[PDB]
Amino acid sequence: TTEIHPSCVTRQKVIGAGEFGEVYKGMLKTEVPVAIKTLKAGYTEKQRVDFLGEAGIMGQFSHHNIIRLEGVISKYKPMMIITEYMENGALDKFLREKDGEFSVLQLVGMLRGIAAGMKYLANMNYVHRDLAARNILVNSNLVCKVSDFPIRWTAPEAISYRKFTSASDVWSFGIVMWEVMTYGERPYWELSNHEVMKAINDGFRLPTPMDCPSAIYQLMMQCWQQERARRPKFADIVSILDKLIRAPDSLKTLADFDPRVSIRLP
Ligand SMILES: Cc1cccc(NC(=O)c2ccc(C)c(Nc3nc(-c4cccnc4)nc4c3cnn4C)c2)c1
């Protein structure tokens, strides 16, 4: 793993909180803006294992749609994980702040990216477990990168008996699809966590977003199959989203939106 000397790192502002440290924005000389996760004095043995273990696996990943590791500071204290900085931040907040500002093709393109990075993770035998728009970062080319800094996002088997697999990630990716196409709406709106699980078990599923291609709704619906073996694999998801994008007239057929309010005018 690329070891970085602390003299090359300039922390500037705090932007979040880690396991046992803060997360900063800063500069890296070799000047490149970076995000910095620190492990502060007093960390436990387990925290160090997880911290440097996160660094190790990130260093193994090399994919367009996975956040890139710039390097690590492990020979000096505080220890640091240093990644590329993504100017547009977390996808959930991004979309909520840019409601209606993109084309359907752009939105589906985001989803293709996320799916490509998840296919890569799943093939590397990495189970994310917390896939959600809030863990996806967006750069100045609209490229979405899976990161890892959730009842409503979690497959039934992962909730019920903690079976977390790439197939439970697929369920979550279904929910991310809906997040994207709704521009960051809260999945299941104000339903409580227990009402969500009850709804799912009862067989209900999130309704179609407004202005949503029929193909895209069909795909998220198949990510939400109760039977884990029936869900698409990420290879299936990437393949469909790539074909839809490359034949973009396919996205013009829209699923019917179920109106929650009727407005009558002559
Ligand atoms: C695939 C995988 C597997 C396993 C683990 C991971 N780990 C990371 O993805 C990770 C690890 C370290 C860092 C420095 C980053 N960077 C960022 N984290 C945050 C942030 C974090 C926490 C609270 N608020 C914001 N914000 C950022 C970046 C970059 N730009 N921005 C705006 C990400 C990834």
What can you tell me about this protein's structure?
- The protein is α+β, with helices and mostly antiparallel strands and 266 residues long.
- It has two domains: 6-84, 2-Layer Sandwich (Phosphorylase Kinase, domain 1); 89-255, Orthogonal Bundle (Transferase(Phosphotransferase), domain 1), CATH 1.10.510.
- It is built from eight helices and seven strands.
- The chain has helices at 45-60, 91-97, 104-123, 156-161, 166-181, 193-202, 214-223, 234-246, and strands at 9-17, 22-28, 32-39, 69-73, 79-84, 136-138, 144-146.
- The strands form two sheets. The chain has a five-stranded antiparallel β-sheet, with helices on one face.
- β2 and β3 (32-39) form a beta hairpin.
- The structure holds ligand R3L.
- Residues 9-245 form the Protein kinase domain.
Summarize this, please?
The protein is α+β, with helices and mostly antiparallel strands. It has helices spanning 45-60, 91-97, 104-123, 156-161, 166-181, 193-202, 214-223, 234-246, and strands spanning 9-17, 22-28, 32-39, 69-73, 79-84, 136-138, 144-146.
Multimeric state of these chains? monomer
The SSE string, one letter per element, is EEEHEEHHEEHHHHH
* Distance, first to last CA: 68 Å
- Output the CATH topology of the largest domain: Transferase(Phosphotransferase), domain 1
Beta-strand fraction estimate: 15-25%
**CATH class value of the largest domain:** Mainly Alpha
Class by alpha and beta content: alpha+beta
| Helical residues, percent | 25-40%
Main features:
266 residues; alpha+beta; Phosphorylase Kinase, domain 1; Transferase(Phosphotransferase), domain 1; five-stranded antiparallel beta sheet; two-stranded antiparallel sheet; 37% helix; globular; binds the ligand Cc1cccc(NC(=O)c2ccc(C)c(Nc3nc(-c4cccnc4)nc4c3cnn4C)c2)c1; transferase; Inhibitor; Complex; Protein Tyrosine Kinase
